[PDB]
């Protein structure tokens, strides 16, 4: 199938950034949900999971695991990875910061309830004082609609996804970043993104 | 300077994989060690650290942070990232597995002493039963000297580095993987790698 096939639980988890990037690229995709231990064991026994873990994406004859490998391939394939290696260096630097903050926020519910408060205060401080200032500064410096190269790249999508999660986590964290507010509304208005934001899409709930 | 400039503590930590890749590529580099809080604050105040953290590498007019961004740029620049995006997909999938295991092993000393035993047993199980079998299988399947494309790529260097750390951590973990033993000796014998393995190089101690 030329539709990529996404193997994961029926949940956001580690697959959601790949759903976002495919949706932004206008690429229809199929999901095969892991609903049982037998589902996972079959993928493992069939040799489909190089390190016995999901996300796995079947695409272009490959069985790709590791979300960073999956995202890199999708971004290159659909021209969302910039035009040269210096542009990719900016995209990667920006993207890695976003993934680090996203990981901290996701880790809050996997962490035991008695440490969730302490890691929540830390995640909020890092959001307000380390990560969002860096991206506000990028947008303020060049004044362009997109993070890199004055055109849509993968990291605009990664940032929108993060901004949506911040709004779920604590909407007040966004109030002091006006260029990021405007960015969120702009990227949300891209036709493929608008479609993915609508109820009924493959976007997964919190 | 066309020598890249590596900003970090005088320690392996998160900079060592970049030292390895530059050394394997035959690229002379300069180190500027953070020896004081003033050193770090200056980098931060001067706007050199996008997310206020090191590693940072000055290269080709850029101030690159996030080790994955740094490594991606160095690999592309010095032709250690394969020849097409499908080859990069394999390189990335392999590399991400290696980084995940390396992180677990590094985390053992940062973790408090009273949990080091439990995470050590887990790291050893993952080494023996998840990660090293995957790479033994890659080498066994194609029987070639290198992981990807039958030529040296970044991930051969990442794997050698991991194999050296496994040998420090618990040398018995390697005994059942004969193709990985042979791989370690082969990659160690590359002229640029031999040089980096010699006492007196910029390779950092444990
Ligand atoms: Cl990457």
Swiss-Prot record, chains A, B:
The highest taxon in the source lineage is: Eukaryota
Domain GST C-terminal as annotated: residue spans? 85-206
Reactions mediated catalytically: RX + glutathione = an S-substituted glutathione + a halide anion + H(+)
Which GO CC terms are listed, alphabetically? cytosol; mitochondrion
| Statement: the UniProt record of this protein carries the keyword Cytoplasm | yes
UniProt record, GO biological process: epithelial cell differentiation; glutathione metabolic process; response to bacterium; response to stilbenoid; xenobiotic catabolic process; xenobiotic metabolic process
The miscellaneous comment for this protein is: In addition to its enzymatic activity, the homodimer of Ya chains, called ligandin, binds various organic anions, xenobiotics, and azocarcinogen dyes.
Subunit comment: Homodimer or heterodimer of GSTA1 and GSTA2.
| Family statement drawn from the similarity comment of this UniProt entry | Belongs to the GST superfamily. Alpha family.
Indicate what this protein is called per its UniProt record: Glutathione S-transferase alpha-2
Q: Which organism is it from?
A: Rattus norvegicus (Rat)
Taxonomic lineage is: Eukaryota, Metazoa, Chordata, Craniata, Vertebrata
Query: In the UniProt record, what gene is named as encoding this protein?
Result: Gsta2
Portion of the full-length sequence here: 86 to 207 of 222
């Amino acid at each position: 199938a030329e539709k990529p096939k996404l193997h994961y639980f029926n949940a956001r988890g580690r697959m959601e950034s790949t759903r976002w990037l495919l949706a932004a690229a206008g690429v229809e995709f199929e999901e095969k949900f892991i609903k049982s231990a037998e589902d996972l064991d079959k993928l493992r026994n069939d040799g489909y999971l190089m390190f016995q873990q999901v996300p796995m994406v079947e695409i272009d004859g490959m069985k790709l695991v590791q979300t960073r490998a999956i995202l890199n391939y999708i971004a290159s394939k659909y021209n969302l990875y910039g035009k040269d290696m210096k542009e990719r260096a900016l995209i990667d630097m920006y993207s890695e910061g976003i993934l680090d903050l996203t990981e901290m926020i996701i880790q809050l519910v996997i962490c035991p309830p008695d440490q969730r408060e302490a890691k929540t205060a830390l995640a909020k401080d890092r959001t307000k004082n380390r990560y969002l200032p860096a991206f506000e500064k990028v947008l303020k410096s060049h004044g362009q609609d997109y993070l890199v190269g004055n055109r849509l790249t993968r990291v605009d999508i990664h940032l929108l996804e993060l901004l949506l999660y911040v709004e779920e986590f604590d909407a007040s964290l966004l109030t002091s970043f006006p260029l990021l507010k405007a960015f969120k509304s702009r990227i949300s208005s891209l036709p493929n993104v608008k479609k993915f934001l609508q109820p009924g899409s493959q976007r997964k709930p919190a």
